[PDB]
Amino acid sequence: MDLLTAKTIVLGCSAVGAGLAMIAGLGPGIGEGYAAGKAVESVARQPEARGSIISTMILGQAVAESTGIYSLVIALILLYANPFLSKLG
Amino acid sequence: MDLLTAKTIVLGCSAVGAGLAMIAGLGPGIGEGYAAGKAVESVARQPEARGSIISTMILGQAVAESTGIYSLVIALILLYANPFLSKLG
Amino acid sequence: MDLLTAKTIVLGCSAVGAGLAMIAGLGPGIGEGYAAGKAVESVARQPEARGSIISTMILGQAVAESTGIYSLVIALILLYANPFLSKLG
Amino acid sequence: MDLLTAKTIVLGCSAVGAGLAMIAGLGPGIGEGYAAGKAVESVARQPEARGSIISTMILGQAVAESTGIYSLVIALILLYANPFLSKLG
Amino acid sequence: MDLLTAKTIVLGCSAVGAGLAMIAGLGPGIGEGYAAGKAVESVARQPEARGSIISTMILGQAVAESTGIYSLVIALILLYANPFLSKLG
Amino acid sequence: MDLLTAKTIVLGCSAVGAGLAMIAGLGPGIGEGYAAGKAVESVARQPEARGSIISTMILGQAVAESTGIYSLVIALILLYANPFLSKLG
Amino acid sequence: MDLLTAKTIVLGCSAVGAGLAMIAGLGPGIGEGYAAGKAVESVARQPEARGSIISTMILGQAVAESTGIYSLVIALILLYANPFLSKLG
Amino acid sequence: MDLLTAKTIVLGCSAVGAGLAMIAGLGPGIGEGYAAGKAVESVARQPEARGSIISTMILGQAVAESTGIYSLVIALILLYANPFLSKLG
Amino acid sequence: MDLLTAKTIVLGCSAVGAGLAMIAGLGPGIGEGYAAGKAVESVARQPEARGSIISTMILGQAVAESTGIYSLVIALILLYANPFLSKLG
Amino acid sequence: MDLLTAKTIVLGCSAVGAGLAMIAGLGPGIGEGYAAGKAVESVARQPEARGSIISTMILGQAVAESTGIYSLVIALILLYANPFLSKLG
Amino acid sequence: MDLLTAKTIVLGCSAVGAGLAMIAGLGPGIGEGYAAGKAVESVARQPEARGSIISTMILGQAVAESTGIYSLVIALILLYANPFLSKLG
Ligand SMILES: CCCCCCCCCCO[C@@H]1O[C@H](CO)[C@@H](O[C@H]2O[C@H](CO)[C@@H](O)[C@H](O)[C@H]2O)[C@@H](O)[C@H]1O
Ligand SMILES: CCCCCCCCCCO[C@@H]1O[C@H](CO)[C@@H](O[C@H]2O[C@H](CO)[C@@H](O)[C@H](O)[C@H]2O)[C@H](O)[C@H]1O
Ligand SMILES: CCCCCCCCCCO[C@@H]1O[C@H](CO)[C@@H](O[C@H]2O[C@H](CO)[C@@H](O)[C@H](O)[C@H]2O)[C@H](O)[C@H]1O
Ligand SMILES: CCCCCCCCCCO[C@@H]1O[C@H](CO)[C@@H](O[C@H]2O[C@H](CO)[C@@H](O)[C@H](O)[C@H]2O)[C@H](O)[C@H]1O
Ligand SMILES: CCCCCCCCCCO[C@@H]1O[C@H](CO)[C@@H](O[C@H]2O[C@H](CO)[C@@H](O)[C@H](O)[C@H]2O)[C@H](O)[C@H]1O
Ligand SMILES: CCCCCCCCCCO[C@@H]1O[C@H](CO)[C@@H](O[C@H]2O[C@H](CO)[C@@H](O)[C@H](O)[C@H]2O)[C@H](O)[C@H]1O
Ligand SMILES: CCCCCCCCCCO[C@@H]1O[C@H](CO)[C@@H](O[C@H]2O[C@H](CO)[C@@H](O)[C@H](O)[C@H]2O)[C@H](O)[C@H]1O
Ligand SMILES: CCCCCCCCCCO[C@@H]1O[C@H](CO)[C@@H](O[C@H]2O[C@H](CO)[C@@H](O)[C@H](O)[C@H]2O)[C@H](O)[C@H]1O
Ligand SMILES: CCCCCCCCCCO[C@@H]1O[C@H](CO)[C@@H](O[C@H]2O[C@H](CO)[C@@H](O)[C@H](O)[C@H]2O)[C@H](O)[C@H]1O
Ligand SMILES: CCCCCCCCCCO[C@@H]1O[C@H](CO)[C@@H](O[C@H]2O[C@H](CO)[C@@H](O)[C@H](O)[C@H]2O)[C@H](O)[C@H]1O
Ligand SMILES: CCCCCCCCCCO[C@@H]1O[C@H](CO)[C@@H](O[C@H]2O[C@H](CO)[C@@H](O)[C@H](O)[C@H]2O)[C@H](O)[C@H]1O
Ligand SMILES: CCCCCCCCCCO[C@@H]1O[C@H](CO)[C@@H](O[C@H]2O[C@H](CO)[C@@H](O)[C@H](O)[C@H]2O)[C@H](O)[C@H]1O
Ligand code: NA
Ligand code: NA
Ligand code: NA
Ligand code: NA
Ligand code: NA
Ligand code: NA
Ligand code: NA
Ligand code: NA
Ligand code: NA
Ligand code: NA
Ligand code: NA
């Protein structure tokens, strides 16, 4: 096996691996969508409390967002800063 | 391995990886759909407050949209600005 | 490898990638169905607000449709404007 | 590679991608079923508004169906108007 | 590659695509079951409105069934009216 | 490729295709479960209407069952009346 | 190829297919679990009607169990009454 | 093909098939957890009806466990009472 | 085929099969989490009955845990007490 | 087959198998999230009961976590104490 | 097999396995989002309790986050501190 073959296989697997990691993004999309609906209902029933409600929404959603970011970071690593390449040469 | 074989395998894996990443889009669809439903419900109870209600809906949905955008970017990178090619030669 | 073999595998992987991307469309189907169901319910309780109900539904459903559109775009690119072909040689 | 081998792989992959795409159909199935159930409970509680309830059900369901149509079209294309065949010769 | 090999591979990928397509059938199973649940509950509360209740259920369920039917059509095509064969010559 | 190799591959893919299709059975499993629960609650609340409730449960569950049967038929066809065999021999 | 090879591949694919088919069992597990929860709640609110409530629960679960059985029959066929073997040698 | 090769492939496939079957166990876990939750809620409100609330819970959970057992049996057969080795020779 | 190759393939397949089986663990995670949720609001509303509430939760969750254990067992067997090795070959 | 080839393949399958096992962690995330939401709702209603609410939350969440831990243990075993290598040499 | 091929195939499998592990992150995303929605709703209805409402959310979400963190750790190990390399040469 030459070096070109080594990179080809590893980067190819890296591409598939990156795609698989990104699937996790469906979760925050669902969970934050729920926090959004609750906010819509809450500002409707109690308009004078709007600012407090939005802050609580953004705070809650930001936390729910993290595992989305984890997947993104993993993907970007496999794409732009692949740790495997240095192990071949 | 010749270069043409190397690129073929990598770009092919990139196509599959891109499709997998896009699956995440199901999440925001569900989540934002929920936010839509609550707006519908809230507008019926308080038709005069519509403006503030959709305003809150859009803000929430926008945040719920992000992980969909992350996947789209990753896919578009793999298709149009593939980072693996330069590593192959 | 010759050119015909290159395109063949890249296009083949592109077809699968397109199919995978379109799976995301299940999301909006669920989410918008939820908005639809809330519209039905709302029209039944406040029938006088039917016009405001329907227009809120459409708008919210339009927003939740977006990631379904993203996937469709990715799939059509892969099928009709494949950006891998011109990278092979 | 000869034309037949090139056609074989491209069409074989096209068959899998089309099947993958059709998986999206479960979404509208769930979402529309929800709208249907809300319609049932509503014409019972409010039999005076049956016309506008069923009218609202159909419209909301139709919008919810669109991504199912998207995937069906992609499948139909891969099946009957395959765009990869022309890239082969 | 000879014609028998061509047909073998293409048909094999078709059997798999068909199975994948049929997966979508889980959606309508969930949605229509929900519509049935509301119908059961509605018949109990308004025993005399059973006619309109059930009629509403069937109509809504029929709509929800459609994408399960699309998948069944795609599968039957791949099995009994395969469009790929006439391309191999 | 000889006849035996052809039949082996296409039948092998057919077994996998049948199993994939059978995955759709989870849907009616869930949906009909929901209708069952609503029946348990409703019969306990409205004993005078038991027969009308159970009858409503069965009809609704039967409609929900349909896509499960579709899958079962496709699986049965692939297993006992395989339509690919006459295209290979 | 020889007989042993033909049978090996087919029986091998049949193992995976049987496994895939069994995945559908998750549905009835969810659906019936839901019916059980409703039974519990009904019994709590009306302890004297425990026998009647249970009876309704078992009936509704029997119906929900059906597609799990379908998947089980398909898997048992592939393992014990494999219809592909007579198609080979 | 020699006998060892035949045994290796089928058992290899059998191992994968067994794991796929076990995936189904997730359903019963969800459904029974729901029943468990209803028991917890019911025991608190009607503590006089405990035991009767518990026994109903166990019964319902027992029923919901069935498809999980089916998958266990299939997995146990593939691992210990493999019905394919008998066909190899 | 030699015995080292035979064991390599069978164990490799066994590793994947163990991973697949463990996926089932998500179900009990969802179900028991629900039971925990009901327990929390019950002890809030009915502080005196805390002993009975925690007791029902543990029992109910124990039941829901079983299929998770079934999968853990299958996995452990595949890893430490592999029943395939002694049939090679 | 040489030893290095044997180890390569079995470890390669172990990496994939471990990744599959970790997928189960999505369950506890959903489940424990639900428990957390019930705690929030409960602390809002009985702010003074916060301490006992947290205790119950932590308990049930701990139970719900178990199958996540199982999956993790299975993965760490495959990575750090692989039970297959000894069978190969 | 030489060292380069061994490293290559293992790292390649490690990338995929890393991606599979990251899928679990969707769970916490859903779960934490749910807790977020409850906070949004609670904070509105009970302004005097915002402090304990928010703190309870953060705590519960943190517990819900753990299995995502586990998957992240596994992925980071496979990418940056690969345990299989040490066993090849
Ligand atoms: C998930 C989707 C996966 C899709 C995978 C598609 C894989 C396509 C592989 C192509 O590799 C070629 O197919 C050729 C044609 O049938 C072979 O003979 C071709 O190559 C030969 C040398 O190996 C000689 O005939 C000449 O070089 C050339 O004809 C060639 O097998 C092998 O190189
Ligand atoms: C999840 C995604 C998984 C993706 C897996 C993709 C696997 C792609 C395999 C491509 O096959 C390789 O092609 C090289 C180029 O043809 C061969 O080396 C060549 O140069 C080598 C070094 O000289 C020579 O030995 C020969 O030409 C041949 O062996 C090499 O052996 C062969 O394996
Ligand atoms: C943080 C986000 C940053 C986004 C940055 C986007 C930058 C895009 C630069 C162009 O991207 C790719 O670079 C490859 C490498 O230059 C090009 O392949 C070209 O060069 C390769 C060799 O380097 C060859 O193998 C290819 O065949 C040849 O097309 C490829 O076409 C091009 O799309
Ligand atoms: C999920 C996505 C999966 C994507 C998988 C893609 C797999 C690609 C496998 C390619 O296999 C190699 O293809 C080369 C052709 O591309 C062959 O070259 C040969 O035939 C070539 C021409 O086709 C000739 O140039 C020579 O024989 C040598 O160069 C080589 O033997 C063959 O092993
Ligand atoms: C969605 C799933 C799609 C799956 C598509 C699968 C397509 C498979 C195409 C196989 O094509 C054949 O592959 C052989 C290899 O298998 C080639 O010969 C090659 O086999 C070797 C490949 O290097 C040569 O070196 C040897 O001489 C030769 O017999 C042969 O020419 C080629 O036509
Ligand atoms: C989910 C989808 C799964 C799809 C699986 C598809 C599997 C395809 C397997 C490989 O096909 C090989 O194809 C060669 C193609 O050429 C044949 O070649 C043979 O007949 C060839 C000519 O057709 C001859 O050159 C020789 O027998 C050898 O080269 C023969 O079938 C076999 O070696
Ligand atoms: C979910 C999808 C699962 C897909 C599984 C696909 C499995 C494909 C197995 C292919 O098996 C090979 O086929 C070749 C076909 O050619 C055989 O060639 C032999 O018999 C051939 C003719 O059929 C002869 O030419 C020679 O023995 C050699 O060329 C060879 O023995 C056989 O092992
Ligand atoms: C769901 C999983 C399904 C898995 C199915 C796996 C099927 C494997 C069939 C293997 O049959 C063997 O295949 C070899 C090739 O791999 C043949 O190689 C032998 O023949 C070859 C092809 O002609 C070349 O290696 C040289 O010619 C010769 O080694 C060999 O005779 C043939 O018996
Ligand atoms: C999810 C399922 C995964 C399945 C993975 C495993 C698939 C099958 C792998 C290969 O098994 C092959 O069987 C051939 C026989 O059919 C062997 O032939 C050899 O021994 C043969 C005779 O037994 C000889 O002819 C030669 O060594 C060559 O032809 C060959 O070495 C061996 O590798
Ligand atoms: C999740 C499923 C993963 C499945 C992974 C399967 C990986 C491939 C397994 C089979 O590999 C073959 O084994 C043969 C031995 O059985 C080797 O024989 C060789 O050494 C043999 C004798 O030991 C010789 O006869 C020849 O080199 C050829 O016949 C052959 O080269 C090698 O390719
Ligand atoms: C869950 C993911 C699991 C991924 C598992 C990936 C396993 C990859 C195994 C690759 O094994 C190699 O395959 C070569 C063939 O492609 C063999 O070539 C040999 O036998 C070949 C024919 O089978 C011969 O041509 C020569 O011995 C050489 O070319 C070689 O020995 C064998 O080590
Ligand atoms: C998701 C997981 C995906 C895993 C994909 C793994 C793909 C592995 C392809 C391996 O191809 C084999 O090993 C070497 C690659 O170059 C080549 O043999 C050659 O190279 C070896 C490594 O240098 C030597 O040991 C052999 O002697 C020599 O014939 C062999 O022909 C080639 O088929
Ligand atoms: Na998070
Ligand atoms: Na987001
Ligand atoms: Na959107
Ligand atoms: Na739509
Ligand atoms: Na429809
Ligand atoms: Na139906
Ligand atoms: Na049924
Ligand atoms: Na059952
Ligand atoms: Na259980
Ligand atoms: Na647990
Ligand atoms: Na946790």
Numbering used by the authors:
A (entry chain B), B (entry chain A), C (entry chain K), D (entry chain J), E (entry chain I), F (entry chain H), ...: 1 to 89
Quoted passage from the original study:
In the Fo sector, eight to 15 copies of subunit c are assembled into a closed ring, which rotates around its axis as ions permeate across the enzyme. The c-ring harbors a series of identical ion-binding sites, typically one per c-subunit, which selectively recognize the coupling ion. We describe the structure of a novel type of Na+-binding site in the c-ring of the F1Fo-ATP synthase from F. nucleatum and demonstrate that this enzyme is physiologically coupled to the SMF. The c-ring features two glutamate residues in each of its 11 ion-binding sites, instead of a single carboxylate side-chain as is typical.
We also investigated the influence of the environmental pH on the conformational state of the ion-binding site, by crystallizing the F. nucleatum c11 ring in NaOH-titrated buffer at pH 8.7. The resulting structure, at 2.6 Å resolution, revealed again a locked conformation of the binding site identical to that at pH 5.3, with Na+ and H+ bound concurrently. As we observed in previous structural studies of c-rings, the detergent used in these crystals provides a hydrophobic belt that effectively uncouples the binding sites from the pH or Na+ concentration conditions in the crystallization buffer, in a manner that likely resembles the shielding effect of a lipid membrane. The finding that one Na+ and one H+ can concurrently occupy the binding sites in the F. nucleatum c11 ring raises the possibility that both ions are co-transported across the membrane as the ring rotates. In sum, computations and measurements demonstrate that the protons that occupy the ion-binding sites in the F. nucleatum c-ring, concurrently with Na+, remain bound to the structure throughout the rotation of the ring, and therefore are not co-translocated with Na+ across the membrane.
